[PDB]
Design a binder for this molecule. Structure first.
Ligand SMILES: Cc1cc2nc3c(=O)[nH]c(=O)nc-3n(C[C@H](O)[C@H](O)[C@H](O)COP(=O)(O)O)c2cc1C
Length: 147
C-alpha cells in the first residue's frame, strides 16, 4: 500500500504528529510519501495513492481558521482526486477553545462531499502531541486495520 501524508503545522505539533504516523505506517511495511502543505500542489495530488492522510491545526478565536500553509490546498481539494479515495484526518488544537480542532471537522466534511471514503474518524489532539504519543500510534494502527 502507498500512503500520502500532507500536513499543515504552525508550531510543529501537527508536524510532529505527521512523523509519528509516518513511522507507524513505514514500520508496518507501507510506502509513505510525506509532504508539508506549504509546498504541495493540489491537482491530482492524491493520484496513485491507496491512503491519503491529512493533517491540520486549528487557529482563530471565535472563528475557525485552518493552519496557514494548509488553506490553499483546502481551497483546491476538488482538484485532488478524492472521489472513492480512502482518507483519514488528524490535527492538534486545545479544548479550552470554542471549536476544538474545528479544522479537522471541516476537511472531513469537505472530503465527504467530494466522495472520499472516511476510513476512520479524525484524531483530535488536545495539547502536546508528545503527550498523546500512544493515542497517535494507536490511531495509525486503527487506520491500517480499516483499509
Ligand atoms: C491564538 C490561537 C488560537 C487558537 N485557536 C484554536 C481553536 O480555535 N481551536 C483549537 O482546537 N485550537 C486552537 N488553538 C491551539 C492550536 O491549535 C494549538 O496550539 C496547536 O498545538 C498548534 O499546532 P501546530 O503547531 O501544528 O500548528 C489556538 C492557539 C492559539 C495560539
Amino acid at each position: 500500500a502507498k500512503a500520502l501524508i500532507v500536513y499543515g503545522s504552525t508550531t510543529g505539533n501537527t508536524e510532529y504528529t505527521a512523523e509519528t504516523i509516518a513511522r507507524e505506517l513505514a514500520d508496518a511495511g507501507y510506502e509513505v510519501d510525506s509532504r508539508d502543505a506549504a509546498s504541495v500542489e493540489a491537482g491530482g495530488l492524491f493520484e496513485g495513492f491507496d491512503l491519503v492522510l491529512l493533517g491540520c491545526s486549528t487557529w482563530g478565536d471565535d472563528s475557525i481558521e485552518l493552519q496557514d500553509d494548509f488553506i490553499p490546498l483546502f481551497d483546491s481539494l476538488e482538484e485532488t482526486g478524492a472521489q472513492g479515495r480512502k482518507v483519514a484526518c488528524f490535527g492538534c488544537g486545545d479544548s479550552s477553545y470554542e471549536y476544538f480542532c474545528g479544522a479537522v471537522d471541516a476537511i472531513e466534511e469537505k472530503l465527504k462531499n467530494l466522495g472520499a471514503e472516511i476510513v476512520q474518524d479524525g484524531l483530535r489532539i488536545d495539547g502536546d502531541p508528545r503527550a498523546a504519543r500512544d493515542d497517535i500510534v494507536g490511531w495509525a494502527h486503527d487506520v491500517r486495520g480499516a483499509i
